[PDB]
């Protein structure tokens, strides 16, 4: 019990994701080494993205944050 593992982004999707493929997003733990956000695609996929990139901050604006 306690101390469950956490989901962290150890790498990033390089090429910008088209919004129409995505449903929402959620931030990773601030304790993760690499600061990242996970985009949830409409297909169901979980994609790691670099929050420093303008395109991702754009998606963060346009998409709603989702709860786990």
UniProtKB/Swiss-Prot annotation:
GO terms for molecular function: chemokine activity; CXCR chemokine receptor binding. Disulfide bonds join 8-32, 9-48. Keywords: Cytokine, Disulfide bond, Secreted, Signal. It is found in: Secreted. GO terms for biological process: immune response. Belongs to the intercrine beta (chemokine CC) family. Monomer. Interacts with human chemokine receptor CXCR4. This is Viral macrophage inflammatory protein 2. The lineage of its organism: Viruses, Duplodnaviria, Heunggongvirae, Peploviricota, Herviviricetes.
